[PDB]
Amino acid sequence: PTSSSSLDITSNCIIETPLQPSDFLPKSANLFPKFPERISVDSWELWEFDTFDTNGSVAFGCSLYRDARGVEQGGFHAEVNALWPDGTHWGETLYFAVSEVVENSDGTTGGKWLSKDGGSITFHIASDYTAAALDFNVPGKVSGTMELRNHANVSPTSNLPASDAEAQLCPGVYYTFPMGPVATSVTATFSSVGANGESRELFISSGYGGMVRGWSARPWPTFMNDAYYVVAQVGPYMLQILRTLGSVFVQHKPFAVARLYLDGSLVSAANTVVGGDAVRLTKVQPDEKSQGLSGKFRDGNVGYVLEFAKKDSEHGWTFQISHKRAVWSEPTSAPGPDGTGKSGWIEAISGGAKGENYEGHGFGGQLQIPVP
Numbered sequence: 001p002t003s004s005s006s007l008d009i010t011s012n013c014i015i016e017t018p019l020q021p022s023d024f025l026p027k028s029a030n031l032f033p034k035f036p037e038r039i040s041v042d043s044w045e046l047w048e049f050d051t052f053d054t055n056g057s058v059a060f061g062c063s064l065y066r067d068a069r070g071v072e073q074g075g076f077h078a079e080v081n082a083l084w085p086d087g088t089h090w091g092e093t094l095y096f097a098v099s100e101v102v103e104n105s106d107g108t109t110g111g112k113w114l115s116k117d118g119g120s121i122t123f124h125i126a127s128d129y130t131a132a133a134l135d136f137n138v139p140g141k142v143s144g145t146m147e148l149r150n151h152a153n154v155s156p157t158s159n160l161p162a163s164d165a166e167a168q169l170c171p172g173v174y175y176t177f178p179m180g181p182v183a184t185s186v187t188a189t190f191s192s193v194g195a196n197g198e199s200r201e202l203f204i205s206s207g208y209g210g211m212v213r214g215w216s217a218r219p220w221p222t223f224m225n226d227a228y229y230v231v232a233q234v235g236p237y238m239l240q241i242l243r244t245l246g247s248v249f250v251q252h253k254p255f256a257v258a259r260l261y262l263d264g265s266l267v268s269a270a271n272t273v274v275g276g277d278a279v280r281l282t283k284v285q286p287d288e289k290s291q292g293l294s295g296k297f298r299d300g301n302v303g304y305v306l307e308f309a310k311k312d313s314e315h316g317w318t319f320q321i322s323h324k325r326a327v328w329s330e331p332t333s334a335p336g337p338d339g340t341g342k343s344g345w346i347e348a349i350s351g352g353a354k355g356e357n358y359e360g361h362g363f364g365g366q367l368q369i370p371v372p
């Protein structure tokens with residue numbers, strides 16, 4: 001243990017004026033907190049670990065945050081979501097008074113979100129970013145373990161962004177995928193699941209998914225009002241993308257961070273959206289395509305077309321994304337004809353380059369917030 005960042009909500013670790021993060025470290029996973037001593041009311045940091053099975057029937061995701069959003073609910077927030085094959089879901093925001101992140105002499109990174117009652121979520125990440133382990137010990141809620149492993153010939157290190165511009169969604173907003181393609185497993189037990197509130201176990205093995213590391217001093221409404229995130233496996237392709245559509249505060253500009261791997265090699269890295277590669281992400285409406293669920297809010301899309309293009313590509317890669325199974329649904333405004341919300345999906349996805357028709361699944365989510 002060589003570097004430690006330990007924050008408690010209760011102690012003044014949260015200041016009401018802006019703070020500049022630590023500089024972006026090129027060719028690093030930047031897993032150590034960029035706001036190590038204190039965060040501002042605007043600042044946020046994310047360590048996210050999402051999994052799903054190869055059959056697109058089971059999902060389990062954990063987002064660990066450091067931000068001020070959960071202070072009046074007594075902690076830092078962790079978002080835990082699960083879907084079973086019968087369509088039953090479990091979704092909770094979990095609050096933890098203490099968040100601790102350490103870098104160890106062996107080069108591993110450890111994180112612990114710790115409650116007053118002794119309950120915790122912990123992560124442990126390899127020095128070369130090829131493995132991550134989470135342990136859940138939240139009494140009355142969820143216990144178990146999650147593992148993500150990169151088995152690629154090419155090291156995660158060789159694919160890490162080499163500049164701020166390759167690590168950024170937009171100025172001052174960092175969003176990264178340091179593990180690249182991962183095999184996943186989950187063994188978990190939930191105390192109360194479904195209408196009957198009976199305990200249930202969840203298992204994934206040799207599944208798919210991905211890890212996100214992001215941070216900013218800029219709060220989300222200042223750079224977006226709509227976002228789509230997905231991690232997916234489509235035959236030999238592994239893809240991960242965040243795409244935002246701007247609020248009035250960025251003159252409605254769109255932004256994206258996107259990566260596309262072929263059998264563990266990085267083939268397309270895009271930090272630009274055209275709607276040094278570029279992505280195009282276009283919503284599919286239910287009057288255009290017969291397959292795909294819509295969400296329950298004002299966004300009626302039934303999926304997306306995702307294209308990755310180079311400057312020296314004729315056709316690049318095109319992926320058709322259809323919403324197949326609902327994971328979570330939560331409003332983000334008062335109800336009405338323009339009521340907004342957030343929707344998580346198991347996605348069905350197909351395509352590749354011209355002449356390719358690979359098929360697989362993703363774990364996706366979309367959000368709108370009522371910022372003009």
Ligand SMILES: CC(C)[C@@H]1CC[C@@H](C)C[C@@H]1CN
Pocket residue numbers: 225226338339340368369370371372
């Ligand atoms: C409620 C308003 C009309 C919505 C809010 C969500 C955003 C994505 C689009 C509009 C604002 N342009």
